[PDB]
Design an enzyme around this catalytic site. Structure first.
Site, PDB file in Angstrom:
ATOM      1  N   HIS A  67       0.765  -1.232   0.000  1.00 22.13           N
ATOM      2  CA  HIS A  67       0.000   0.000   0.000  1.00 22.13           C
ATOM      3  C   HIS A  67       0.799   1.287   0.000  1.00 22.13           C
ATOM      4  O   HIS A  67       0.203   2.365  -0.140  1.00 22.13           O
ATOM      5  CB  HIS A  67      -0.952   0.017   1.214  1.00 22.13           C
ATOM      6  CG  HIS A  67      -2.091  -0.923   0.957  1.00 22.13           C
ATOM      7  ND1 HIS A  67      -1.930  -2.290   1.003  1.00 22.13           N
ATOM      8  CD2 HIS A  67      -3.370  -0.703   0.585  1.00 22.13           C
ATOM      9  CE1 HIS A  67      -3.079  -2.870   0.707  1.00 22.13           C
ATOM     10  NE2 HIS A  67      -3.974  -1.930   0.452  1.00 22.13           N
ATOM     11  N   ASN A  96      -5.467   1.316   7.992  1.00 22.07           N
ATOM     12  CA  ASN A  96      -6.824   1.814   7.798  1.00 22.07           C
ATOM     13  C   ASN A  96      -7.159   2.913   8.800  1.00 22.07           C
ATOM     14  O   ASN A  96      -6.776   2.840   9.971  1.00 22.07           O
ATOM     15  CB  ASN A  96      -7.823   0.657   7.924  1.00 22.07           C
ATOM     16  CG  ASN A  96      -8.403   0.228   6.590  1.00 22.07           C
ATOM     17  OD1 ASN A  96      -9.518   0.618   6.227  1.00 22.07           O
ATOM     18  ND2 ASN A  96      -7.662  -0.569   5.837  1.00 22.07           N
TER      19      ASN A  96
END
Lengths: 509, 509, 509, 509
Positions: D83, D195
């Site tokens: 990511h 997240n």
């Protein structure tokens, strides 16, 4: 690159060259007569005890009051000193230079009434690679490049500072570097230097060049993604484009057929080249990119004209002995061009993003459900696919036009302005958004084609693959990707893919 | 007005004529061969048991599956019935007509593979002044004029409703009115009728015409305000404009000198024509309005081309026997033109408003501190001066471009669309804003000139005064003004001032 | 619905009621003293030969000059007559009424210095259902509801026209209908009637109500789509929402659990309620719709306050004998609320569209690849799925804020204005866009659930299915869909689904 | 500044403190139980051979497939590595820190299922002033602070780079600096770290603080300009504000009376304090600035809540043994707050600009026709007056909202996103525009008051004069002004005027 300037004949190519690198220039002899002539007009106006606004009147309420001839030299200096009230970071040497060369081109057309020796001074700072301090903000594209132009002229009068060899010197040490001494100005010369659309014009020009570089890149990148997903070439069939009759699109399709050729090992290795329809983001590339080319061509024309424009005030017509006050300093045209260019830049970025999405999806490409090799082990670049969405989206807001805004300045005499500087400035960031997007397309398509082991695409397209791969390795799996994007962006910014586009398509190229 | 159409040769003038009033047309004989030929191509494809997408395949997943020849007639009908899922109020007969004539022009170029008898049917509805029900919303400018185009074809198959003599009849009673019977369609004919950029093109065209009418009006109106405030003519001097080299502005200045002439009783009655500088809103009219003319000229070119474009899919090339799927149904070009036109419309409205403000002020005009005769007894139109601010401001937001937005439709195969319909639709309201603004300028300038007892302006400008005064009296003081504006708007909308502009300036005029 | 008004205590519910239907009102006796008192203050100012701006001075340059007491009655009348320079179509009776009731509430707080008999007059026009002609455009939300408010007061002085029983009568015949006679005004009464934020406040209020109705509808619609595609209920788990701590979202989730219940036959008939993750457009409904609820709650507070505000000028403080000139007529607050509400309306429309897309796709729902039954026979509503994209996209541009724009009016004394009228007006069209979108969601979800033969959803949700199906049949296949949407829109507009939302969630509900 | 953090109790003040300077923190013991507890829940899930998404399933298609327990540690690492595909310049240490502290606060609420030792690690990097490399771009405000958050966690696993003492070290040398070693992650810990809404929240928070600082400054600056032009204090009368009932405005007026006092030598030296009306830009300051305060208060509430929010996924409820997948990672709320704050920032800049214009004009102030002393000798700051117009205008476009845009990412499962990062990022530049504007107001008012020889304004206002004059001299005439603005901007940025505003007005102050 030595230029012998014949004022007002600048091409967009030369402008690209000036924007891009150091320029050595000198005036063409055909220049001398009109310049020198406009000065003698001003000069005789003074001597006949006549009084003319912009030449020897005061300003505002006094716009009607004559200024003692010997008072005139201090007017200039007051004008310059006063208007340098800009703000922001200082322009890079590139933009300064360009603005310097645009003002020079402009004055030299001999409508401005300022001595050649003053023009000669500017040219000398250009030739010496001495760039006066100009801050990014302050101008509303109306009432002369006023602050940026004032900040420029400061150095000429031994004031402010200039950059040389990347170091800030004094306007004095830097004047000397150029082989000069601080200058004193005469009638009209203050208004001649500070007034014009050069600042906004350079801003818009940089955006055009940018928009141009992205366009080319986007044809190479869109060509690889077609291959990466085994797309069709039929969407590029000349006949479909001539039937629509749109030129931008006609030329765009042509560019596509040139880069892809009739077929490739890759393309040849897939049974047929028809079957299922391709998605709009592939199929409608000529149409969309074609619309974009038109847009950037329209602006280029306007901007090409403005770069050679006599944009100060008032203007002097030595042939008839007339001095006239107009409003050529209003950059509405330039503003609209800048706004125009915004749409092309955004829409190029928009189409590339949907091609990225297509590629990452478990189809739209025909490769890995993400390129890597499983959403469950790792999960490849579905993510870089997110980064492009973020960059593309930005450009939607940045597209909001500035040429529709205006504020009544300095007592509703200056009751309508252009906002050309901001219209143009914003394209630079817009191009960064679109450049990151394409870079990610570039990286993705090459990754995908890679997966098709040992297969080759078109000759120009293999060149595009190699350009990447020469600096960024296949990213076959789990490891820090950011630095791939970072690298791809640079190559794009260094014009890596620009040379693959057929010649004479783009205005400046 | 009878036209003998030679497909794809439509001019913007004729388009203006078609948009403006009833049209009687028939095809040119040179037309018959290509149309008839494209049909026989489709026809032989069918007969050779070959299967071709858009011609005799299914759609989507089945885009690969052949449709029983006898199954084909029901495909058409299913296509038409299915896509008529539009929304909003129904287009006025004018726009319908225009769209009808654009689709006809398009099909008749013989690239669409549909029978002449089907084209002939459309033409008959045009000639009869029977206008099928088309709702304003639903299309994203990509995948064919899909709903609006579907809603159009409905009537052809004896479905939906049509307007005739301003009354909604049935697609059946109306077909009969046109001397027709409900029609059945054949291969490709479904995709030929429903696909295209005609809807968005008509929308954008109406906006162009509007933008055009406002432009002209704005030259007459800006001419009166110059006079009303005893402004200069020197800003219009041809030499200043040629020195900038901008064509839009060059032509605009020319238009101004034409309307004002070298001088007037009014202008002549003020000592000199120089003294104090005029405010930008006066002085920079060529520059700003000039920038606007360019803008609307660029769009016009794009839109002029699109009106004659073969915009369906797939396209059939009978000469080579080829059927190709492209994406000409993508209206990106049109979208950008519409967005383009937004800037011109806004900026015309913007400049007119600042002229109103100038006029109302205790100077910027040289008349009453408000026009009436004292802010303390009554207070005249300082107010209508507010209404124009409200209308001008609106256009700032309405200028936000639609061509930068896009939504992935019908399963990311249709993953990039144009939004051309909305880009164009919004110009109509934008023109209402700018028209009210000008109307108020018109009324204000005439009021002001009035105050200069018994004085006259230019010959064309006196015509503009009289056009107003023929319907709206001098509003010398306290009484309900709204109805003055209301009336002025209408006259503008009836093109009252359009005839004063010199010929061949505007694309469609 | 009879109301006994206690000024400044209006709730948003009552405002909803007033906006929605005819209102009978009368003042509360507690009202009489402050109103009557402010008049006697003005009255004694006059009698003490004192001179006060707004009360007995002239305007502008003369703002300093006393007006002959007997001259004062003509001032009023001149003020009214002069400011009615609005433009556009006339407001519907609903909005007029609301504005009438807001001005009444405002004046009656006894800070305005106008006779009760004048307030009483307004109330009588309200009670009689006589609605003065007010045009949509002209106001910049600063300097009093100036035109719309002027147009209102016209009828009071036996001028202009009023609507009654849907017919335009004369301000005279209509005054009589209300049992009235043309009125003459006194000191301050002109500024009291024409100044205020009522017009913009009613505009913004209508938008809030709209935004409110859409919200509710969107909870029912999003509930059906969850079912239609066999989505999870776990995203609605109270604990996830309390852990974020966002109230809007907390209340939104709660609303969702209320409508869906712990489970349904439908939901129960699918093995588990977890497995594959739901797409954001389903899963993040509390978060997004929750963000929207907050937005519309913030605006409501501002607008709730403004509806009871003393918004004229100057204001009179009878207790201290003071008359003060402020700027409460500046509707900045209202403008920002309107802009605020734009985001909620758009984002509700945005989320619903992605749910439509999900539904139409060959998954995102788990039903037909389009709902119908094959993209190749027919192809169902993939299309209505396009119409929603067109409506959703529009709202992106319409979201551009108006509260950031401003034009210096009437001589840079009025050098900053709000633009509140336009901020608010645009929400109405924005709600039409979002309403068509939801209607299409509504129709789609019910179509989909239908396909799940004989299965039932929640009790409230079955009510939502039936509400539709009571007027629009299952559209199981090929036939003209537009009329389904048309019908669904109406039901939505009649608040069909509003009653399913739990009470006390929405400000006005 | 040592903090003993009790998770989720962060105030905006503390957040201001954290954003502003180095922070030393440690957890409160009340924290340990919930954190440790959520881990044991995850841990027992694993041990009971149960399989839970987000905890021990794969991702995407495999979201349904269990990952070999010993396979789990490599999942984390793959998640993090994958990511970090962000782009742009690296965030300044300030923002990093803030984001670090927000993620820490969030995890520590014990809903995230990650070891305290991992939280402890983050805290140690905070305490050591070691700031991981985070690039400005990549996140769409949905699917976790995904890239920026990934880039953060990189250093934790001995990857990427971190800044320390302003130098880039390795994630290894920097971990050591913090007294740490590279870390390995366990189940859920990958999703717990990557997240969240922290990135967007910090962006929006910085904008709020900025908006806050500008507000305060604007009250001091607007106070001087009132004096500079001998304006009235009556517009600030508490009674007018309470009568409107708007709180923002009520508090704003109060702030104004506090800074100006009932009167000054300056104010006292002008006959009366009523006469001619003040222009809106003066008079309507409470109304406009009041509307702005409300706006920034609304956002602050949303942002205050989000800073303490449990924003990862899925969330673990150890008390019931439940693991639930929601969508708290969707930053819609934050996006809208950011968009909200845009309007306040713009409108503060807008009002200040019109005050500058007023001041420069041959009145609107009552001083020099430009401040200097003649438009004809020199011409003072009519120009800096132009620079502010350019900055104010920009903010009009920058106000275009980002929360209305969205792109379907990673296969229409992530089919709606927030764009919160861009909504917030753009406020920073918007504050620079407004800060330059005010600086110019600041400089102008002090210049003007100066001209009123030896006269003094209020006590707080004299402090504001002195703050300037301590670093920027009176600019009584012709000389380079840019450097005055430059200096004024800095002082503003150093919060020079912040201390003059009464306490408890602004959320974080």
């Amino acid at each position: 690159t030595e230029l012998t300037l014949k004022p007002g004949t600048l091409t967009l190519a030369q402008l690209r060259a000036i924007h891009a690198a150091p320029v050595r220039l000198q005036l063409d002899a055909s220049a001398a007569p009109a310049i020198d002539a406009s000065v003698a007009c001003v000069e005789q106006i003074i001597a006949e005890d006549r009084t003319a606004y912009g030449i020897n009147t005061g300003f505002g309420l006094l716009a009607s009051t004559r200024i003692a001839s010997h008072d005139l030299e201090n007017l200039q200096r007051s004008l310059v000193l006063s208007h340098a009230a800009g703000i922001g970071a200082p322009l890079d040497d590139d933009l300064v230079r360009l603005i310097m060369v645009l003002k020079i081109n402009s004055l030299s057309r001999g409508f401005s009434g300022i001595r050649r020796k003053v023009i000669d001074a500017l040219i000398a700072l250009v030739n010496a690679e001495v760039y006066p301090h100009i801050p990014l903000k302050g101008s509303v594209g109306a009432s002369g490049a006023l602050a940026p132009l004032a900040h420029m002229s400061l150095v000429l009068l031994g004031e402010g500072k200039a950059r040389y060899k990347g170091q800030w010197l004094s306007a004095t040490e830097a004047l000397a570097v150029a082989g000069l001494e601080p200058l004193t100005l005469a009638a009209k010369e203050g208004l001649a230097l500070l007034n014009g659309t050069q600042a906004s014009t350079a801003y818009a020009l940089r955006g055009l060049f940018y928009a141009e570089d992205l366009y080319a890149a986007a044809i190479a990148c869109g060509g690889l993604s077609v291959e990466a997903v085994l797309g069709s070439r039929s969407p590029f069939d000349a006949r479909i484009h001539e039937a629509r009759g749109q030129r931008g699109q006609i030329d765009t399709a042509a560019c596509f057929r040139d880069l892809l050729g009739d077929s490739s090992e890759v393309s040849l290795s897939h049974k047929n080249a028809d079957k299922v329809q391709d998605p709009y983001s592939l199929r409608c590339q000529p149409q969309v990119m074609g619309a974009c080319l038109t847009q950037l061509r329209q602006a280029a024309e306007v901007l090409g004209i403005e770069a050679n424009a006599v944009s100060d005030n008032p203007l002097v017509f030595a042939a008839e002995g007339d001095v006239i006050s107009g409003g050529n300093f209003h950059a509405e045209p330039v503003a609209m061009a800048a706004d125009n260019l915004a749409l092309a830049i955004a829409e190029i970025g928009s189409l590339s993003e949907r091609r990225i999405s297509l590629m990452m999806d478990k189809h739209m490409s025909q490769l890995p459900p993400f390129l890597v090799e499983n959403g469950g082990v790792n999960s490849g670049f579905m993510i870089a696919q997110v980064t492009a969405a973020a960059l593309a989206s930005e450009n939607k807001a940045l597209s909001h036009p500035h040429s529709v805004d205006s504020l009544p300045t300095s007592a509703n005499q200056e009751d309508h302005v252009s906002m050309a500087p901001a219209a143009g400035k914003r394209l630079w960031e817009m191009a960064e958004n679109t450049r990151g997007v394409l870079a990610i397309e570039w990286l993705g398509a090459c990754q995908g084609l890679d997966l098709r082991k040992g297969l080759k695409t078109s000759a120009k397209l293999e060149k595009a693959r190699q350009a990447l791969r020469s600096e960024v390795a296949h990213y076959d799996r789990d490891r820090f990707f950011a630095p791939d994007i970072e690298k791809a962006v640079e190559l794009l910014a260094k014009g890596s893919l620009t040379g693959l586009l057929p010649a004479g398509v783009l205005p400046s190229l």
